[PDB]
Design a protein around this motif. Structure first.
Motif, PDB file in Angstrom:
ATOM      1  N   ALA A  31      -5.452  -7.300   6.230  1.00 10.35           N
ATOM      2  CA  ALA A  31      -5.426  -6.051   6.966  1.00 10.35           C
ATOM      3  C   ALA A  31      -5.710  -4.884   6.037  1.00 10.35           C
ATOM      4  O   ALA A  31      -5.429  -4.931   4.841  1.00 10.35           O
ATOM      5  CB  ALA A  31      -4.075  -5.854   7.645  1.00 10.35           C
ATOM      6  N   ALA A  32      -6.268  -3.822   6.605  1.00 12.48           N
ATOM      7  CA  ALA A  32      -6.537  -2.615   5.834  1.00 12.48           C
ATOM      8  C   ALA A  32      -6.412  -1.434   6.786  1.00 12.48           C
ATOM      9  O   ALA A  32      -7.217  -1.289   7.707  1.00 12.48           O
ATOM     10  CB  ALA A  32      -7.905  -2.661   5.181  1.00 12.48           C
ATOM     11  N   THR A  33      -5.399  -0.612   6.563  1.00 13.77           N
ATOM     12  CA  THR A  33      -5.130   0.550   7.389  1.00 13.77           C
ATOM     13  C   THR A  33      -5.181   1.801   6.530  1.00 13.77           C
ATOM     14  O   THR A  33      -4.729   1.799   5.384  1.00 13.77           O
ATOM     15  CB  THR A  33      -3.762   0.427   8.055  1.00 13.77           C
ATOM     16  OG1 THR A  33      -3.709  -0.791   8.800  1.00 13.77           O
ATOM     17  CG2 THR A  33      -3.527   1.581   8.994  1.00 13.77           C
ATOM     18  N   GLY A  34      -5.739   2.870   7.080  1.00 17.46           N
ATOM     19  CA  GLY A  34      -5.775   4.114   6.345  1.00 17.46           C
ATOM     20  C   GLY A  34      -6.737   5.126   6.910  1.00 17.46           C
ATOM     21  O   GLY A  34      -7.661   4.766   7.637  1.00 17.46           O
ATOM     22  N   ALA A  53      -2.376  -6.968   2.557  1.00 20.19           N
ATOM     23  CA  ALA A  53      -2.402  -5.694   3.250  1.00 20.19           C
ATOM     24  C   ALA A  53      -2.733  -4.572   2.281  1.00 20.19           C
ATOM     25  O   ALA A  53      -2.453  -4.649   1.087  1.00 20.19           O
ATOM     26  CB  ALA A  53      -1.060  -5.417   3.918  1.00 20.19           C
ATOM     27  N   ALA A  54      -3.336  -3.516   2.813  1.00 18.78           N
ATOM     28  CA  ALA A  54      -3.654  -2.347   2.000  1.00 18.78           C
ATOM     29  C   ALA A  54      -3.578  -1.130   2.911  1.00 18.78           C
ATOM     30  O   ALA A  54      -4.387  -0.987   3.828  1.00 18.78           O
ATOM     31  CB  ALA A  54      -5.021  -2.473   1.353  1.00 18.78           C
ATOM     32  N   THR A  55      -2.600  -0.275   2.658  1.00 18.07           N
ATOM     33  CA  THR A  55      -2.378   0.925   3.442  1.00 18.07           C
ATOM     34  C   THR A  55      -2.481   2.143   2.540  1.00 18.07           C
ATOM     35  O   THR A  55      -2.031   2.120   1.393  1.00 18.07           O
ATOM     36  CB  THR A  55      -1.007   0.882   4.109  1.00 18.07           C
ATOM     37  OG1 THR A  55      -0.902  -0.307   4.896  1.00 18.07           O
ATOM     38  CG2 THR A  55      -0.818   2.076   5.007  1.00 18.07           C
ATOM     39  N   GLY A  56      -3.083   3.206   3.054  1.00 17.76           N
ATOM     40  CA  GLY A  56      -3.171   4.421   2.276  1.00 17.76           C
ATOM     41  C   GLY A  56      -4.174   5.412   2.809  1.00 17.76           C
ATOM     42  O   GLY A  56      -5.081   5.039   3.550  1.00 17.76           O
ATOM     43  N   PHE A  57      -4.036   6.674   2.429  1.00 22.68           N
ATOM     44  CA  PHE A  57      -4.886   7.727   2.949  1.00 22.68           C
ATOM     45  C   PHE A  57      -5.376   8.601   1.808  1.00 22.68           C
ATOM     46  O   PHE A  57      -4.992   8.427   0.653  1.00 22.68           O
ATOM     47  CB  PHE A  57      -4.140   8.560   3.991  1.00 22.68           C
ATOM     48  CG  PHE A  57      -2.926   9.249   3.460  1.00 22.68           C
ATOM     49  CD1 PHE A  57      -3.012  10.521   2.937  1.00 22.68           C
ATOM     50  CD2 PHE A  57      -1.697   8.630   3.494  1.00 22.68           C
ATOM     51  CE1 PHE A  57      -1.903  11.157   2.451  1.00 22.68           C
ATOM     52  CE2 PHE A  57      -0.583   9.266   3.009  1.00 22.68           C
ATOM     53  CZ  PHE A  57      -0.687  10.532   2.490  1.00 22.68           C
ATOM     54  N   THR A  84      -8.233  -0.988  10.481  1.00 23.04           N
ATOM     55  CA  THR A  84      -7.920   0.133  11.347  1.00 23.04           C
ATOM     56  C   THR A  84      -7.917   1.415  10.531  1.00 23.04           C
ATOM     57  O   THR A  84      -7.464   1.434   9.387  1.00 23.04           O
ATOM     58  CB  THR A  84      -6.559  -0.068  12.010  1.00 23.04           C
ATOM     59  OG1 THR A  84      -6.556  -1.313  12.713  1.00 23.04           O
ATOM     60  CG2 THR A  84      -6.279   1.042  12.988  1.00 23.04           C
ATOM     61  N   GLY A  85      -8.433   2.486  11.118  1.00 21.92           N
ATOM     62  CA  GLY A  85      -8.417   3.754  10.426  1.00 21.92           C
ATOM     63  C   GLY A  85      -9.340   4.785  11.026  1.00 21.92           C
ATOM     64  O   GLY A  85     -10.278   4.437  11.740  1.00 21.92           O
ATOM     65  N   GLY A 134      -7.777   3.118   2.799  1.00 20.44           N
ATOM     66  CA  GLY A 134      -7.190   1.862   2.373  1.00 20.44           C
ATOM     67  C   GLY A 134      -8.182   0.726   2.495  1.00 20.44           C
ATOM     68  O   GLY A 134      -8.711   0.489   3.582  1.00 20.44           O
TER      69      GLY A 134
END
Lengths: 62, 62, 62
Positions: free
Chosen positions: A54-57, C54-58, B56-57, B32
């Protein structure tokens, strides 16, 4: 037998890059990043997933 | 036998890039990111998925 | 037999990079990063996942 995902060569060359020549400024902002090479799994009686990525941002300018 | 996904070469060359020549500014914002090379799985009695890859982003300017 | 994810070569060459030639400034901001090479798992009676990434960030500019 069953050469699944094997004998690769240069799986990915640049990923997230900013390649250039003869510039004068080269910012690069990546937030939170996970870079890996080979990700091999081998299961027998799964009931979830085999490999999740997953990759959110987001990105706000002003 | 069963060369599934094997004997690759340069699976992906640039992914997310900003290639250029003779510029003067090269921002790159990716939020991300998950960059991987080979992702091989091998299951026998799955009941979920084999490999999931969600992303997602959003991007807001002002 | 079952060469899953094996015999790789250069799994990933640049990941998150800022390659250039003849520049004058090369900032690179990555926040929080996890870089790994080979990630091999081998399970028998899974009930969750095999490998999660997972990878989260802005990124905010102003």
């Amino acid at each position: 037998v069953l050469y699944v995902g094997s004998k690769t060569k240069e799986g990915v060359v640049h990923g997230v890059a900013t390649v250039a020549e003869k510039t004068k400024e080269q910012v690069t902002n990546v937030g939170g990043a996970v870079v890996t090479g080979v990700t091999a799994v081998a299961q027998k009686t799964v009931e979830g997933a085999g490999s999740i990525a997953a990759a959110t941002g987001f990105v706000k300018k002003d």
